[PDB]
Write a protein that binds this ligand. Structure first.
Ligand SMILES: Cc1cc(N2CCOCC2)cc2[nH]c(-c3c(NC[C@@H](O)c4cccc(Cl)c4)cc[nH]c3=O)nc12
Length: 116
């Protein structure tokens, strides 16, 4: 069984996380936890049972809260899947999510291969 030091996951995965953040305007809806009242979508938690966003993912990676790197992959897809569930398939935020997901699928593959 691989043993992953927090510092190894941090340095290896941070560039993939930067690749999501740097997408402008597509990353903006994902940068902070969804605030249903401020956004005027009060049925958000009626639909999304487990919220996830970039700031949470970034904190876990920065402070060493992942035991193994596929939990980071889990959190990223949970964030995308939340957005694809709540938002209609042709809407702006659905398309934004799809753009971030395209970037991620591309960046994460070689990084996960090198982590073993
Ligand atoms: C690539 C892709 C495209 C799309 N759609 C494109 C068309 O438009 C609608 C959205 C939805 C996706 N959902 C998931 C997904 C996971 N993927 C792992 C993959 O990253 C992966 C798998 C093995 C090795 C590595 Cl290194 C990385 C894992 C857990 N739960 C998930 O839902 N992947 C999706």
């Amino acid at each position: 069984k691989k043993i992953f030091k927090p510092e190894e996951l941090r340095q290896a995965l941070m560039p993939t996380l930067e690749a999501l953040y740097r997408q402008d305007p597509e990353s903006l809806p994902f940068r902070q936890p969804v605030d249903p009242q401020l956004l005027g979508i009060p049925d958000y938690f009626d639909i999304v049972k487990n919220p996830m966003d970039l700031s949470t993912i970034k904190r876990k990676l920065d402070t060493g809260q992942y035991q193994e790197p596929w939990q980071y992959v889990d959190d990223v897809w949970l964030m995308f899947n939340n957005a694809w569930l709540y938002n209609r398939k042709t809407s702006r935020v659905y398309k934004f999510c799809s753009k971030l997901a395209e970037v991620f699928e591309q960046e994460i593959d070689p990084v996960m291969q090198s982590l073993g």
